Design a binder for this molecule. Structure first.
Ligand code: NMN
Length: 252
C-alpha cells in the first residue's frame, strides 16, 4: 500500500524482542534492578497500547509499567537534555556519575524506538504510527515520554543540570519535553538550582549564548518557581568530553 494510516514511521521492527532483550541486558548490568521480571515488564508495556486507539493513550495506560520500572536514581546527579542527545549520553558514559533518563530501565527500554497498536485488534502496527504534530499528541510514544520524563523530573534534588543545543534558533524551546514537562515538574522544595549547559555548534570563537533571549526566558520561568538559575557555555564539546575523560593535563 501506497498510503499508510498515519503520518509517522511505524513500530520499530522486532519491537517485542528488542524491548525484551534490552530489559535482560539492563537488569544483568544494573544490580539494583536484579529482581525485575522482564516478561512482566514486556506484559505491562504491551498493556499500555495494544488494542487501544493510538490517538487515545493516557498516562494511566502506562502506570502498570511505571510500577514495574520503579527505580531509585541519585537525585542530585540528574542530567536533563533537549535536542542534544549524543553528547548527553557520551558524557554520562564517562561521567558514569550523572544520569540521563536513558540511563534508567524505562528510558533505556524505549530509547529511539517507535510503537503503536490499533483499536480494532491486538496487532502491533509496523506500517505507520501517529505523528505528534500531524495526527495526535495522545499517541503511545509521546505519552510514554511525557509520563516517564515527569516522574524523572520529580525525583531530582539539589543541582539539576540540562544540556541544550546552542545551534538551534530556540536554544531553550518551551515546546520540547524539557520545556513543557521537565521545567514544570522540578520540585522547588528539593531543587536548589537548575544549571544549563549551552552546547555550541562548533564554529569557534563565538557568542555568549547564555544571553540568548530564550535563555533569559528559561531563567525567568525557573526563578519564578523559586529555583536558582545558572548557565554555562560549552564552546568546544570535543574538548569538554576530552577534559571529562582526562581531568587536567594540557588545556583543561
Ligand atoms: N530518547 C528518546 O527517544 C527521547 C525522546 C523524547 C524525549 N526524551 C526525554 O525528554 C527530554 C528530551 O526531549 P526534548 O528533545 O523534546 O526536550 C530528555 O530529558 C529525554 O530523556 C527522550
Amino acid at each position: 500500500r501506497w498510503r499508510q494510516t498515519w503520518s509517522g514511521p511505524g513500530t520499530t521492527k522486532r519491537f517485542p524482542e528488542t524491548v525484551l532483550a534490552r530489559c535482560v541486558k539492563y537488569t544483568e548490568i544494573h544490580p539494583e534492578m536484579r529482581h525485575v521480571d522482564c516478561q512482566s515488564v514486556w506484559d505491562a508495556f504491551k498493556g499500555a497500547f495494544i488494542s487501544k486507539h493510538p490517538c487515545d493513550i493516557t498516562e494511566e495506560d502506562y502506570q502498570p509499567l511505571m510500577k514495574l520500572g520503579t527505580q531509585t536514581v541519585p537525585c542530585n546527579k540528574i542530567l536533563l537534555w533537549s535536542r542534544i542527545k549524543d553528547l548527553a549520553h557520551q558524557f554520562t558514559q564517562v561521567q558514569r556519575d550523572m544520569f540521563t533518563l536513558e540511563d534508567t530501565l524505562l528510558g533505556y527500554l524505549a530509547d529511539d524506538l517507535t510503537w503503536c497498536g490499533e483499536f480494532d485488534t491486538s496487532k502491533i502496527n509496523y506500517q505507520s504510527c501517529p505523528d505528534w504534530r500531524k495526527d495526535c499528541s495522545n499517541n503511545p510514544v509521546s505519552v510514554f515520554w511525557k509520563t516517564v520524563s515527569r516522574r524523572f523530573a520529580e525525583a531530582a534534588c539539589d543541582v539539576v543540570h540540562v544540556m541544550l543545543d546552542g545551534s538551534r534558533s530556540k536554544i531553550f524551546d518551551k515546546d520540547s519535553t524539557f520545556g513543557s514537562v521537565g521545567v514544570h515538574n522540578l520540585q522547588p522544595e528539593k531543587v536548589q538550582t537548575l544549571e544549563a549547559w549551552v552546547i555550541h555548534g562548533g564554529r569557534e570563537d563565538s557568542r555568549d549564548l547564555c544571553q540568548d533571549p530564550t535563555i533569559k526566558e528559561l531563567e525567568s520561568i525557573i526563578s519564578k518557581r523559586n529555583i536558582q538559575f545558572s548557565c554555562k557555555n560549552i564552546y568546544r564539546p570535543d574538548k569538554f568530553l576530552q577534559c571529562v575523560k582526562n581531568p587536567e593535563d594540557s588545556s583543561c
